[PDB]
């Protein structure tokens, strides 16, 4: 009846220490469609994050893209935490420049 969210956290363009960029949080494979997606800065929930219109795949599981602005720093932790009924606990995935 319900599937659990798969999450990818990455940047629009090849990351470059100090240089400005965009952080994406792509949440897929979930059901029901009711979800909560938060983009964070050093553990501090980032503000006004834009979202795309929700759609779904052939297996009926939904997908959404939350995205904001950020500037890659070796001393800066960025992550995406999502809350969905299918999981025992919220799930956080950190941005990792290698992926």
């Amino acid at each position: 009846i319900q599937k659990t969210p798969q999450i990818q956290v990455y940047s629009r363009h090849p990351p470059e220490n100090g240089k400005p960029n965009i952080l994406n949080c792509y949440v897929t494979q979930f059901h029901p469609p009711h979800i909560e997606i938060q983009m964070l800065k050093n553990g501090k929930k980032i503000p006004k994050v834009e979202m795309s219109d929700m759609s779904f795949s052939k297996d009926w599981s939904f997908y959404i893209l939350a995205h904001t602005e950020f500037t890659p720093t070796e001393t800066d932790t960025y992550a995406c935490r999502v809350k969905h009924d299918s999981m025992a606990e919220p799930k956080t995935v950190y941005w990792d420049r290698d992926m």
């Binding site: 009846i1 319900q2 599937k3 798969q6 990818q8 990455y10 629009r12 363009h13 090849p14 965009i22 994406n24 792509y26 897929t28 059901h31 029901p32 469609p33 795309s52 219109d53 929700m54 759609s55 779904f56 009926w60 599981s61 939904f62 893209l65 995205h67 290698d98 992926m99």
Partner: protein, 274 residues
């Protein structure tokens, strides 16, 4: 070569609250051109592509009330399923519908479809002949009877082979105007020290369009299909997509591996070495 026009409806049935009840999104291939939703007496719309404005406010106003009327119909058929399995009506449920058509200028192939899913599971789908339906459970067999009796199947076939197809070829002509044919991928390969020894060679493809693409790793001409890690193709956020393929290689043997990128916006497959 093959282009599609598809509508993705998500309606929510919750007799216990307000109603941001339905959203419907339309795509031309992998690009959304519009979003309709119930916000408005008969919904409202919001375009997202240049080659769509050419239609005019009158057109999009009519297109919106049609989508809304479809959404109401889609949602109402849920009832057949609730009565059969005798579920409560105040309970919450989800209704999803995807329909559309595609053309393959090459061999001018045409295909269409319409599939309904209730609570995240298959319910009923239109067959390739556009004249019969495949039912997923017993309740859907009731729905199938009702729709043939009502003439719903022919209405859809007429819409699919008529305006859906007409709209796809038009919207397509339109796009050729502003946006270019396709969008080739920019490629390059990174590496990564593997904590367990050896290295991971990662082949990236970014900013491509459409979303379909194939990224492969080879060694002495063989596709390393079972030592290749692929991530799900994902949106760059600017209407473009990205993907990467990784392979773990034994230390010192990097230069032996090559990455192959296949994409329609490339007259020929791209080959990249470490």
């Amino acid at each position: 070569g093959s282009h599609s026009l598809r509508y993705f409806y998500t309606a929510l049935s919750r007799p216990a609250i307000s109603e941001p009840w339905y959203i419907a999104v339309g795509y031309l291939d992998d690009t959304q051109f519009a979003r309709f939703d119930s916000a408005g007496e008969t919904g409202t719309y919001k375009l997202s592509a240049p080659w769509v404005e050419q239609e005019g406010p009158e057109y999009w106003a009519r297109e919106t009330e049609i989508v809304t009327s479809n959404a109401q119909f889609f949602r109402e058929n849920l009832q057949t399923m609730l009565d059969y399995y005798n579920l409560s009506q105040n309970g919450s449920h989800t209704i999803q519908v995807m329909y559309g058509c595609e053309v393959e200028f090459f061999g001018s192939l045409f295909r269409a479809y319409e599939q309904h899913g209730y609570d995240g599971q298959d319910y009923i789908a239109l067959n390739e002949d556009l004249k019969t339906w495949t039912a997923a459970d017993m309740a859907a067999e009731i729905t199938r009877s009702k729709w043939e009796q009502a003439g719903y199947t022919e209405l859809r076939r007429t819409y699919l082979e008529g305006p859906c197809k007409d709209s796809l070829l038009r919207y397509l002509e339109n796009r050729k105007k502003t946006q270019e044919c396709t969008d080739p991928p920019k490629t390059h390969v990174t590496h990564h020290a593997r904590p367990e020894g050896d290295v991971t060679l990662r082949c990236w493809a970014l900013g491509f369009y459409p979303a379909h693409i194939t990224l492969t790793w080879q060694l002495n001409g063989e596709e390393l299909i079972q030592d290749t890690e692929l991530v799900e193709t994902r949106p760059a956020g600017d209407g473009t997509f990205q993907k990467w393929a990784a392979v773990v290689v034994p230390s010192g043997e990097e230069q032996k591996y090559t990455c192959h990128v296949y994409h329609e916006g490339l007259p020929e497959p791209l080959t990249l070495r470490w």
